[PDB]
């Protein structure tokens, strides 16, 4: 039921460990519309993510400034 009229995604995050090494986080995802209406059901593809974490130098609370850049890809035009 959690991907009904929807999608699923799978991916692996690489978190860098202080002083070397990588902590892996394996993600499994399901999306389903909140409404009951028609939606676009895509062919297989991927979202290319890039992210940058910063701090507001004027902010004293525990916080994160997050930038993400995200572009869909992996479906070609024409034949294959």
């Amino acid at each position: 039921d959690k991907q009904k009229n929807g999608i699923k995604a799978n991916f692996k995050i690489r978190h860098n460990i202080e002083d070397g090494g990588v902590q892996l986080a394996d993600h499994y995802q399901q999306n389903t519309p909140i409404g009951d209406g028609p939606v676009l059901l895509p062919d297989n593809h991927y979202l290319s993510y890039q992210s940058a974490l910063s701090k507001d130098p004027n902010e004293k609370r525990d916080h994160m400034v997050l930038l993400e850049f995200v572009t869909a890809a992996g479906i070609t035009l024409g034949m294959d």
Partner: protein, 152 residues
């Protein structure tokens, strides 16, 4: 052009994020605002832990804390589930398995509330090691790039 929901993302959209979390009994809340620009595939958020000190590293929450703002260029517009579900929106659920540590489970509703795109989330984490990389805060404050593979 392809869905009506797509129309909602042709300019800069304001965003609100609200998260309630509980990891190994360590409860916290995060609240955020900023904006998204699907034309460029870009979003920016400032996210504050409103309960004081975040008990997990900020990087571990990045994926939890808006794939409707992905740039879907050209023919990709025919495959853009996220925007077509708007403005009523969608539920996004995950399990996130940290290798050799605990896991997060999340449920978020991503929808328009007036002219603001809202991401309202709950998170529960269990089985974390008290001095593993998460609860022991041994992750660098940075992030790398990744591909999120979508299938229907």
């Amino acid at each position: 052009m392809v869905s009506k929901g797509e129309e909602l993302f042709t300019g800069v959209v304001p965003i609100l994020v609200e998260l309630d979390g509980d990891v190994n009994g360590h409860k916290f809340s995060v609240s955020g605002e900023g904006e998204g620009d699907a034309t460029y595939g870009k979003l920016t958020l400032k996210l504050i832990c409103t309960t004081g000190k975040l008990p997990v590293p900020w990087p571990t929450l990045v994926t939890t804390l808006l794939q409707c703002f992905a740039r879907y260029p050209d023919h990709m517009k025919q495959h853009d589930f996220f925007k077509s579900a708007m403005p009523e929106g969608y539920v996004q659920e995950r399990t996130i398995f940290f290798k050799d540590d605990g896991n997060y489970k999340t449920r978020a509703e991503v929808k328009f509330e007036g002219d603001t795109l809202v991401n309202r989330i709950e998170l529960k984490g269990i089985d974390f090691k008290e001095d593993g990389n998460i609860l022991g805060h041994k992750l660098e404050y940075n992030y790398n790039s990744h591909n999120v593979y979508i299938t229907a």
